[PDB]
Amino acid sequence: PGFDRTRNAEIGNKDIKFKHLEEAFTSEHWLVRIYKVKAPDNRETLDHKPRVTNIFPKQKYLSKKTTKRKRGYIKNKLVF
Amino acid sequence: SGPRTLVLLDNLNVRETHSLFFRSLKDRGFELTFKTADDPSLSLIKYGEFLYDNLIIFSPSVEDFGGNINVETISAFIDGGGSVLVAASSDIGDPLRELGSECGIEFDEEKTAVIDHHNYDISDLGQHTLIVADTENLLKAPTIVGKSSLNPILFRGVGMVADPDNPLVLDILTGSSTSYSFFPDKPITQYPHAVGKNTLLIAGLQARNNARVIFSGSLDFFSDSFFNSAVQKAAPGSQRYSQTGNYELAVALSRWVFKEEGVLRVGPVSHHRVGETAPPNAYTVTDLVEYSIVIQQLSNGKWVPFDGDDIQLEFVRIDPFVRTFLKKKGGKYSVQFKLPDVYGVFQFKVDYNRLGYTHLYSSTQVSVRPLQHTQYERFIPSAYPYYASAFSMMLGLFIFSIVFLHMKEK
């Protein structure tokens, strides 16, 4: 699947993703590739998942959403 | 930002018990639409339009918003130019925590509260969960929290923390000196999250696109009972105050987030040589240059000229060669100076960044070319010999000719 016709050797890193670049143009035989340098990060994010302790069970909720049933869930909602 | 606003309610009766805030908000001139957080007809973009210019979340304890309100959708909404306000009580729910983690502010656990044992109001449930925050530990920027003096405020919410070396985040209201955030029922085993004066109560963000976001961390801060209560710490001898001073702070916060109090705008810039009126192409080296910019501030509903004591101009190539203070004349900040000896492509960066104001940034590119071959100094006095010499020999040659061809032998 991945093969370099010059360096007759299969590439080791099949999947690569960019963080500050994006592909702008790529010629027909992939001879010349032009990338676009994006704008700086809109806002900073946390490097880690927010704090989760083991004192109370997490009990993560399940998606429960189709392309037909688009209705969310609220814990503190008065039932009818 | 436009006046249309969306309110995400929790039980649809919350509007009744938050009536005062919304009546004020409408009186300022916003169009409020109240929906329930789980509503199938709920959406922000429709064919890339952003049909709601402001967003307000007063629905803590949500796990999935109704419709296509993801957390990536609200993130794209903040990246588009909108301004959100989110309030969260002691039942957080996952997507509010995740929105906080997207902006850079980390909420605490879902069952935690800002517990303080020295600053609890008399009107408490015996858990000391209600926390009376003083007006001392505030941000001290009059664009955000208003000009007047405020009475001690009331708070009942989850304590968040923000990165100390974070350039974008703000801290509108930190906790007290002894307040800690941990489960009120369970004993303290781990190190509690945000244990001291780094407990944040109200925390704001001013993004790179100038999108104002406020995390309030307590819904009851905006309530109708806390606008009209009476506050006094339960420590003996403490004074009793008639009004909680919560209303003025809430109004100032609401005005800041929805682009009404502190806004700056950059008008037309103009550079030209001293004595001319049109910008030349390719200034020469060491040429008098005049730079003029107009900055406007949104006062009430109209744009007025800006006061602006400290505003700096940078003339950069890769790193600044000249930095000067712009000076006000007429209605524009204008400065005249000289171009340095180095030739190249130089650009003017006027970047005004302040605590509370918007981020102003205007950079214009200009090329400083060296002297032409005609603009070199000529007929200098120091070289009057050499000139002489050359011409002397010319004269000599001519004389020589008249004496070399018509010479008479003897």
DSSP letter for each residue of chain A? ---BTTTTB--S------SSEEEEEE-TTS--EEEEEPPPPSS---SSPPP--SSS---PPP----SS----EETT----
For residue A50, which residues of chain B lie inside 8 Å, CB to CB?
Answer: 97-98, 100-101, 106-107
CA B119 from centroid of its chain's CA atoms: 32
- Torsion, Cα B15 B18 B24 B26, to 10 degrees, reads -10
For residue B86, which of B260, B243, B257, B232 has the smallest C-alpha distance?
B257
Among candidate residues B264, B297, B319, the one where a domain is terminated: B264
**Of all helices (H) and strands (E), which one includes residue B103?**
helix B94-103
Q: How many CB atoms lie within 10 A of CB B357?
A: 18
One domain for residues B190 and B161: yes
User: What's the gap in Å between the CA of A13 and the closest CA on chain B?
Assistant: 29
User: End of a domain among B264, B283, B308?
Assistant: B264
Distance separating alpha carbons of residues B137 and B334, to the nearest angstrom: 38
Task: Indicate whether B230 and B359 sit together in one domain.
Answer: no
- Count of domains forming chain B: 2
Q: For residue B83, how many other CB atoms are within 10 A of its CB? A: 22
End-to-end CA distance of chain B: 108
Q: Are residues B237 and B217 in the same domain?
A: yes
Across the interface, which of B64, B163, B208 has its CB nearest the CB of A43?
Answer: B208
For residues B251 and B396, state if they share a domain. Answer: no
Q: Best mutation site among A41, A52, A55 for testing chain B: the one with the most B CBs within 10 Å?
A: A55
Contacts of A27 (CB under 8 A, 6+ apart): A33
| Element at B35 (helix H, strand E) | strand B31-36
| Burial class of residue B53 (count of CB atoms within 10 Å of its CB; 0-12, 13-18, 19+) | buried
B360 touches B352 (CB < 8 A): yes
Q: B80 and B14, same structural domain?
A: yes
In this structure, the answer to whether residues B258 and B269 fall within a common structural domain is no
Q: How many CA atoms lie within 13 A of B62 on its CB side?
A: 28
Q: What is the domain range of residue B85?
A: 1-264
User: Treating both helix axes as pointing N-terminal to C-terminal, what angle do B71-80 and B94-103 enclose, rounded to 10 degrees?
Assistant: 40
3-state secondary structure of B247: helix
Distance CA B64, CA B103 (A): 19
Please indicate if any CB of chain B lies within 8 Å of the CB of A77: yes
b/e code B2-37 from CB counts within 10 Å (16+ = b): eeebbbbbbeeebeeebebbbeebeeeebebeebbb
B314 touches chain A (CB under 8 A): no
Q: Are residues B231 and B298 in the same domain?
A: no
Same-domain status, B98 and B198: yes
Residue B259 backbone zone (phi > 0: left; psi -120 to 50: alpha; other: beta): left
Same domain, B111 and B7: yes
Spatial distance between the Cα atoms of B217 and B86, rounded to a whole number of angstroms: 8
In whole angstroms, what is the distance from residue B238 CA to residue B119 CA? 10
- Interchain contact, B101 vs A72, CB within 8 Å: no
What six digits make up the tokens of B113?
Answer: 């509260």
Q: At what angle do helices B19-28 and B246-257 cross, to 10 degrees?
A: 50
Q: In the A/B pair of chains, how many CB contacts fall below 8 A?
A: 102
For residue B398, what are its two tokens? 């001519």
User: Does B307 lie in the same domain as B250?
Assistant: no
* Distance separating the N- and C-terminal Cα atoms of chain A: 58
Q: List the single residue in B65, B166, B186 with the smallest CB-CB distance to A44.
A: B166
Q: Residues B307, B388: one domain?
A: yes
HEC sequence for B319-364: CEEEEEECEEECCEEEEEEECCCCCEEEEEEEEECCCCCCCEEEEE
Is B48 near chain A, with CB under 8 Å? no
The token pair that represents B122 in the structure block: 């008399």
- Give B236's contacts (C-beta < 8 A, 6+ positions apart): none
Instruction: Please say which residue of B244, B264, B284 terminates a domain.
Output: B264
Sign of the dihedral through C-alpha B221, B225, B227, B232: negative
**Residue B129 sits in the same domain as residue B112:** yes
Helix (H) or strand (E) holding B401: helix B384-404
